[PDB]
Amino acid sequence: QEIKKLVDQNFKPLLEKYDVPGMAVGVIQNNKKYEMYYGLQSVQDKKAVNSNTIFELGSVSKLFTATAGGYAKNKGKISFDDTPGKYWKELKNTPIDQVNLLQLATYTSGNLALQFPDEVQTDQQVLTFFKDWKPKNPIGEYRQYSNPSIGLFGKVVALSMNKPFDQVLEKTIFPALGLKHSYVNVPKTQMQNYAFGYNQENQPIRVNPGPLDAPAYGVKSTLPDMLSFIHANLNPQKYPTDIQRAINETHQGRYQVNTMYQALGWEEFSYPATLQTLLDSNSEQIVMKPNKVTAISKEPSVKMYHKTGSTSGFGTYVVFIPKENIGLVMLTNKRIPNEERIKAAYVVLNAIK
Numbered sequence: 001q002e003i004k005k006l007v008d009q010n011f012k013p014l015l016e017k018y019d020v021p022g023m024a025v026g027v028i029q030n031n032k033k034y035e036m037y038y039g040l041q042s043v044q045d046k047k048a049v050n051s052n053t054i055f056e057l058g059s060v061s062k063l064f065t066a067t068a069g070g071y072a073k074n075k076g077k078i079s080f081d082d083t084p085g086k087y088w089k090e091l092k093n094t095p096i097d098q099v100n101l102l103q104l105a106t107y108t109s110g111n112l113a114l115q116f117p118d119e120v121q122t123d124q125q126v127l128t129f130f131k132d133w134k135p136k137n138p139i140g141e142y143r144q145y146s147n148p149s150i151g152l153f154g155k156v157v158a159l160s161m162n163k164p165f166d167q168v169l170e171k172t173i174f175p176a177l178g179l180k181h182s183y184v185n186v187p188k189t190q191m192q193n194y195a196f197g198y199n200q201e202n203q204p205i206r207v208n209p210g211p212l213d214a215p216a217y218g219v220k221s222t223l224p225d226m227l228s229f230i231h232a233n234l235n236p237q238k239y240p241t242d243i244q245r246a247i248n249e250t251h252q253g254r255y256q257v258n259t260m261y262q263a264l265g266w267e268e269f270s271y272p273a274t275l276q277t278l279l280d281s282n283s284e285q286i287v288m289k290p291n292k293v294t295a296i297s298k299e300p301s302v303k304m305y306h307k308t309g310s311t312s313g314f315g316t317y318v319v320f321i322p323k324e325n326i327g328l329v330m331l332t333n334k335r336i337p338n339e340e341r342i343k344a345a346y347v348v349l350n351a352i353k
Ligand SMILES: *[B@]([O])([C][N]S(=O)(=O)C1=C(C(F)(F)F)[C]=C(C2=NN=N[N]2)[C]=[C]1)OP([O])([O])=O
Pocket: 057, 058, 059, 060, 114, 147, 206, 207, 208, 209, 210, 217, 287, 308, 309, 310, 311, 312, 313
């Protein structure tokens, strides 16, 4: 009743403030979905954002990679104590076959940065990168937010399931989540629904191919689909047994970096959380530098979870709180500062609770 008015108060000004052509905000509360749409999926085409608009999720893709890993661990196909060598035959007995599937997933190999270097691109020279991989920091002790790390994990998960990564998500994970319009590759019959992203010059753009892009930042979805994914995270008991387990796996905190608990993809906090706690989670320091991990001391009673994502032309934020049975999704076709994403959501979900 007030939900639409709250989103209007808190999300709608951001379109003018950052010259964002288009935005989709979804709220799910007590199993009722609310969708709110603003502006255009394509400026040049004057095509409006609607329930069919496909946006790039950026690193919110990692939540799908994490979920696919939980599914594989609960079908017996993998173990999070394993190392890559067990699956990627060409890496076995190399120094990367010393780091385990969990550590890759949660960014602790000691020696992986946010990107593969630009020169790495083909299937052949990704293999060579990890062959010549040599340690630096103490395996398992330092959190380094990393596309190569989680990418490796996804590629491994795919190996364990026999099928390439793109097929794991589209033939296995997305259907098991009831998602009808989420893709690693947008088919031809859906290109008309794929938004333009818009860069900082407001030029229209879409995501560039890169090494192990699919598992790290390569998923595209709609607002109804993302609201179903949040529904699943809030109420997994209803889903097939194996995806229930996969989902519960993604909620288990593994370590803390001060006040952010790292789960499989999801960031976890004690609920209620202060706004500032939610922001610090995505600081330069956490995001860009290595940081020393600490074991979980206070196991939070009531937990919330979040994740940001960005491609060059798109912004995503996703948040849910199990015990309040509430969640939010924001999708945009121009990046806005992570902090503005996190803050508007804070004010809406509080105002409703
Ligand atoms: B993720 O979405 C990964 N972010 S990223 O920083 O590695 C990244 C970006 C961008 F800089 F936008 F974030 C963009 C692209 C891109 N590739 N082709 N077109 N754009 C790839 C990676 O997590 P967070 O939210 O922390 O940035």
